[PDB]
Swiss-Prot record, chains A, B:
The lineage of its organism: Bacteria, Bacillati, Bacillota, Bacilli, Bacillales. Homodimer. The N-terminal domain probably binds unfolded/aggregated proteins; the C-terminal domain interacts with ClpC. The chain holds residues 140 to 237 of 239 of the full protein. Enables the recognition and targeting of unfolded and aggregated proteins to the ClpC protease or to other proteins involved in proteolysis. This is Adapter protein MecA. Disulfide bonds: none annotated. Coiled coil: none annotated. Belongs to the MecA family.
Swiss-Prot record, chain F:
The gene is clpC. It comes from Staphylococcus aureus (strain NCTC 8325 / PS 47). Induction: By heat shock. Transcriptionally regulated by CtsR. Up-regulated by heavy metals such as Cu(2+) and Cd(2+), but Zn(2+) and Co(2+) have no effect. Forms part of an operon with ctsR, mcsA and mcsB. This is ATP-dependent Clp protease ATP-binding subunit ClpC. The chain holds residues 206 to 273 of 818 of the full protein. Transmembrane segments: none annotated. ATP binds at G3, E4, P5, G6, V7, G8, K9, T10. May interact with ClpP. Required for growth at high temperatures, probably by acting as a chaperone during heat shock and targeting heat-denatured proteins for degradation by ClpP. Required for biofilm formation. May act as a chaperone regulating CtsR activity. Coiled coil: none annotated. Belongs to the ClpA/ClpB family. ClpC subfamily.
Amino acid sequence: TRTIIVKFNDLEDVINYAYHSNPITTEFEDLLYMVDGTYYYAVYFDSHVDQEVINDSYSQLLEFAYPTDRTEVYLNDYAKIIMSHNVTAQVRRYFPET
Amino acid sequence: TRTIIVKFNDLEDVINYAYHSNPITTEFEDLLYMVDGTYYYAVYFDSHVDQEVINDSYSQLLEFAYPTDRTEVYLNDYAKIIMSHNVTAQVRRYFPET
Amino acid sequence: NLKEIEQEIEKVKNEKDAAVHAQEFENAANLRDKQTKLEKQYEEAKNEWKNAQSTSLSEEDIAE
Amino acid sequence: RAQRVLAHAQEEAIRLNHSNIGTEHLLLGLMKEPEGIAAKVLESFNITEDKVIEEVEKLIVGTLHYTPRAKKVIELSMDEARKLHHNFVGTEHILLGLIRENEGVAARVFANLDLNITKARAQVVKALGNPEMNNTPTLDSLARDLTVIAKDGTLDPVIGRDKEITRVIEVLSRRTKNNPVLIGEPGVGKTAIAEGLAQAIVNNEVPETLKDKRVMSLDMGTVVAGTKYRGEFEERLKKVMEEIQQAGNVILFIDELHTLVDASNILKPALARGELQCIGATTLDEYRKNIEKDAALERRFQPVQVDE
Amino acid sequence: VILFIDELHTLSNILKPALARGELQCIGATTLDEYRKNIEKDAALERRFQPVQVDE
Amino acid sequence: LIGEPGVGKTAIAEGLAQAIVNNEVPETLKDKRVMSLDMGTVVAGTKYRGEFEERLKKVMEEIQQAGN
Ligand SMILES: Nc1ncnc2c1ncn2[C@@H]1O[C@H](COP(=O)(O)OP(=O)(O)O)[C@@H](O)[C@H]1O
Ligand SMILES: [Mg+2]
């Protein structure tokens, strides 16, 4: 699948990934969802990206967050979109480093 | 295998082997390890020494020593090298007769 | 009162092992010779003990 | 312990110029220390340093911190040290922690290099293992062993009860009625006498006769499980008895001996025959009211007074 | 873990593997009638259990 | 054997057994087995109905068959 989701317990973990992670030099589209305070990170890859970069990212998120416990359909239903197409840039611009 | 490891409960057994044993006129390299007071004896034969001679020497070792209770990897990690490349000779030259 | 030899035997053996653990072989041989001497003295003490190792039941032992 | 891998982690982070310290860095450090058990075990699976370096480079300042997954891996490795390896943690514990947490860049490298997880765990266990690969089950369950506690050193010391301990020692050395009874008010130290006897046994103070005899406190809490079934408690009493018989090195401490004097007809032949040696603790009033009345119990037990 | 067992009187030698040496910390509760009858009459329970009277 | 405690009744039974072993008894008791039975052992583990009677009956039948 080209749609992954990971689970950030707190916005501190999101800030940690935005600052201290150097993701693979790849192009992708990022959306941030929130339900009951839990942050869900959804990134969508175009038709030219390999699943190896996807597992590497899912591990860096896994190095900063947890695997998703909610399906994509459930998040598209009940989760409020918080950020789209720019996650790291906007948290870096607003939030400072830990 | 090319590595023979035997365990000496005490130093007296090491001296007993050093003086009272008559190994086959073979070429080998020997080291003496020590963990928790227990002594371990390792002998490495050349590539040209046959396996039957290895087993023969191992069974000659068992007269004065017990079969090893720790693997070679654990010994190389944790055990301290007490003597190198000449165990019988150095034990004989340092400690006197029983 | 023979206990005053076992403790020094234990101390000498522990010092023996600690000394050989540090690749100090001359001190090791000296300590081993001392340990052998102390072990022989302890064996001699045990020998005098078993030589001292008869008691009879008297009328007073029963009166008590 | 081997902290040089943790020391590597920063150095390899600078060398690769990464902004974090991940599980792949820890794997690179395990490679950096060839002496390690983890390095040898992973080398046995043809997983060597240059291949790991190439895989990490294919896969993946100053504010470098261990990623939450790296911290989780370290915590798991400490928890894996609960394999009776005390506080000290080694490289193979770290490798086992990485194996258990099959998530992260290290897990991705293992999958990419086709390394089996269960086989690696078995290899580590065998490397840590031993290459070369009587008892009273019921008594050890319903009774409290005092000699093992004394050997462990957890038993509290006994002070000043030298005369009582010597009296117990000389009573136990008799041929016919070698069963002492400790008579005293509650809370004076009657159980402390048995504990001190166990300490003397451990400290090699007892004579040659009691040199290697265990002191097992037969707690009489619920040995009488059911008072209505015929023989339900008699059966387990007989079982405890023949277990004590088959291993003739068990001294038995029975607190509140007067509660058992239902079991008189079973304990009487064994005590009179010499298969069981017993130490009892009772009160003077209870002793006079129960044990002194029966002449059969007097022909077995010898009173010892424990004073406040 | 601190173990709580209500109706303690419904429960010694069932649980000495953690009560003889105090491995289980019993924090149970019972009435005075069910305490004097079977808890006060036991030697092992007197060694470990301490009566905490609960007031009206 | 009737007597005060500690007079030697069990000693009397043991002496009879020793006389059997040393063979100083009449011919009718030359090779008899003196077997000491404790009733607490017989009653041990007898919760269900009829088990004690069954055990005692088997013991008696064995005594009758052996005859010694
Ligand atoms: N002589 C002694 N030396 C050390 N501790 C003692 C001594 N006598 C009693 N104690 C302590 O005081 C407590 C008293 O309990 P104890 O008198 O043994 O109960 P019981 O008399 O019912 O056997 C024990 O837990 C023991 O630790
Ligand atoms: Mg009798």
